[PDB]
Amino acid sequence: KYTVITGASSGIGYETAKLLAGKGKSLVLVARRTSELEKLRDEVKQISPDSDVILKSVDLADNQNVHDLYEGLKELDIETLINNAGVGDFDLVQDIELGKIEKMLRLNIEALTILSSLFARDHHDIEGTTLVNISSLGGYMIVPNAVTYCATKFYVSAYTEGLAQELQKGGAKLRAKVLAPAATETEFVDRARGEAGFDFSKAVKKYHTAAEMAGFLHQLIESDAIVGIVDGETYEFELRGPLFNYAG
Amino acid sequence: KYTVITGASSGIGYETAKLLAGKGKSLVLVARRTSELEKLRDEVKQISPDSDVILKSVDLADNQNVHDLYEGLKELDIETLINNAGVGDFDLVQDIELGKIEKMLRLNIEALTILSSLFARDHHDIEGTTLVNISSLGGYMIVPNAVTYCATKFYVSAYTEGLAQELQKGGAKLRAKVLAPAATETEFVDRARGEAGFDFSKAVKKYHTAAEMAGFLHQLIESDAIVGIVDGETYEFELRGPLFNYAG
Ligand SMILES: NC(=O)c1ccc[n+]([C@@H]2O[C@H](COP(=O)([O-])OP(=O)(O)OC[C@H]3O[C@@H](n4cnc5c(N)ncnc54)[C@H](OP(=O)(O)O)[C@@H]3O)[C@@H](O)[C@H]2O)c1
Numbered sequence: 001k002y003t004v005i006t007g008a009s010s011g012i013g014y015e016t017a018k019l020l021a022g023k024g025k026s027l028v029l030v031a032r033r034t035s036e037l038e039k040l041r042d043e044v045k046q047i048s049p050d051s052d053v054i055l056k057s058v059d060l061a062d063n064q065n066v067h068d069l070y071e072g073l074k075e076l077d078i079e080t081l082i083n084n085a086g087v088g089d090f091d092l093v094q095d096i097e098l099g100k101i102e103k104m105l106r107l108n109i110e111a112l113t114i115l116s117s118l119f120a121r122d123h124h125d126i127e128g129t130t131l132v133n134i135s136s137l138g139g140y141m142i143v144p145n146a147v148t149y150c151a152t153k154f155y156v157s158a159y160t161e162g163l164a165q166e167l168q169k170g171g172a173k174l175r176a177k178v179l180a181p182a183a184t185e186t187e188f189v190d191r192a193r194g195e196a197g198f199d200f201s202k203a204v205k206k207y208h209t210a211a212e213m214a215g216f217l218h219q220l221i222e223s224d225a226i227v228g229i230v231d232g233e234t235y236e237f238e239l240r241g242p243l244f245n246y247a248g
Numbered sequence: 249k250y251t252v253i254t255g256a257s258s259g260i261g262y263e264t265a266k267l268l269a270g271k272g273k274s275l276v277l278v279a280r281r282t283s284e285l286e287k288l289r290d291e292v293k294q295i296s297p298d299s300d301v302i303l304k305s306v307d308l309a310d311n312q313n314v315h316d317l318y319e320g321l322k323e324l325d326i327e328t329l330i331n332n333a334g335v336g337d338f339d340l341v342q343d344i345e346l347g348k349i350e351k352m353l354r355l356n357i358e359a360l361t362i363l364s365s366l367f368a369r370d371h372h373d374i375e376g377t378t379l380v381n382i383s384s385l386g387g388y389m390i391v392p393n394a395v396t397y398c399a400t401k402f403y404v405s406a407y408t409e410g411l412a413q414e415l416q417k418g419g420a421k422l423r424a425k426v427l428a429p430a431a432t433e434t435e436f437v438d439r440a441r442g443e444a445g446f447d448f449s450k451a452v453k454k455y456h457t458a459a460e461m462a463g464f465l466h467q468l469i470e471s472d473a474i475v476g477i478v479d480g481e482t483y484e485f486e487l488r489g490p491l492f493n494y495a496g
Pocket residue numbers: 006007008009010011012013030031032033034058059060061083084085086087088107134135136137180181182183184185186187188189191
């Protein structure tokens with residue numbers, strides 16, 4: 001039984017991989033940097049010798065690539081799929097680089113939608129299955145200077161909240177959940193603004209570590225809650241139901 | 249001075265083109281079916297002899313096509329861009345047709361985001377410009393059996409509400425607006441479910457006509473409101489401010 005974690009080379013996906021290794025889970029770890037995926041596999045084997053770890057060096061910003069990824073796991077028993085890979089951008093809309101933003105849409109929205117749709121197709125009536133889509137507090141509240149990225153997370157939040165309630169009302173075995181972190185200490189900011197060195201310790205007054213966010217993600221999987229969300233002011237993690245209007 | 253209307257060959261965009269014709273505006277009408285674009289241009293000339301009417305047969309579900317559409321309009325003075333083209337689907341997520349849904353994402357989301365970003369880049373500091381993106385009441389309220397489509401509209405609403413407030417806070421000249429129709433008598437249901445003949449008169453107990461929704465769109469352009477939205481319970485058209493949380 002496997003747990004698929006996209007965006008496993010760094011940040012939340014990376015630490016989630018390590019936390020799930022400590023539970024004896026076997027992993028499919030997806031990202032582009034093979035080097036880091038291999039060093040993580042080495043950590044995972046010393047944490048948990050009997051875990052199986054499959055690596056997949058895949059750019060998920062290409063729709064065909066995402067299809068290929070999934071059909072290549074057809075002969076695996078996947079209990080959890082975690083749509084964690086995603087990128088950010090800080091800039092006024094009038095200043096954006098469309099090539100980067102277009103790529104952001106293909107990763108944040110499409111890849112996640114392809115994998116969620118395919119997982120749901122084959123796993124809705126299968127006992128013990130979980131889908132966890134990583135949104136953001138930015139997917140429930142709009143943040144200045146990050147309009148485009150926030151809107152990808154609004155998509156993710158609304159899509160997962162509607163998929164979750166679809167599967168509940170239909171009596172599915174598959175459970176779908178959304179994680180909405182707040183500021184979490186990872187590479188995300190450095191990628192988003194395009195230059196390294198951003199220091200959360202010095203520049204952000206409240207943030208979780210990547211390990212703390214792996215821990216929240218794991219508790220979300222271990223709950224009957226659809227939404228795991230960090231409060232923007234208290235930075236308490238809350239497991240709760242949907243935030244948006246449901247017309248049902 | 250031109251008003252660009254994507255999705256002009258039927259429905260809201262078609263009736264919007266005719267309304268703006270009666271005000272003497274010149275139009276750039278974008279859709280795939282040349283046939284109907286020429287039929288509308290004939291109507292526009294009969295309403296408005298002196299209106300200029302450029303037609304563009306373009307599939308906007310291709311990102312390159314959307315760039316090409318815009319770069320080809322750079323010789324023109326565009327006062328208004330209306331991202332109206334969009335497509336729906338009624339289906340459990342487990343039952344969708346990915347090729348249809350992936351095309352829906354490229355049109356409902358990407359096309360609109362390319363055209364809005366490029367319009368915003370060249371027109372933010374230009375007096376009298378207006379960007380109007382068409383979302384839906386299902387972009388503020390999740391509707392069963394249309395999870396994926398509603399999420400494209402949550403993207404549109406959140407993107408445009410965030411862009412609108414970005415332009416206000418930064419003193420732009422450009423105004424950005426979002427329209428959120430409810431049931432509107434168009435080809436939209438027929439295209440979404442794949443089969444013709446859906447009858448609003450017999451099947452839907454409250455709905456607006458396409459001409460009424462073009463009127464609401466024109467009301468929204470002529471206001472300081474960021475949002476023009478049909479209330480699901482009263483079916484009154486409301487001009488109001490943003491609905492989502494703004495962190496600034
Ligand atoms: N950090 C925060 O404050 C925060 C808050 C809310 C939500 N989030 C969300 O958290 C998730 C993880 O981000 P993070 O904070 O952990 O940042 P991160 O450390 O930069 O991790 C992003 C991950 O995505 C992978 N990735 C990026 N582009 C990819 C592509 N085209 N194909 C495949 N994999 C790709 C990266 O590895 P490769 O580059 O090697 O592929 C990396 O593993 C994202 O959904 C992000 O939006 C972050």
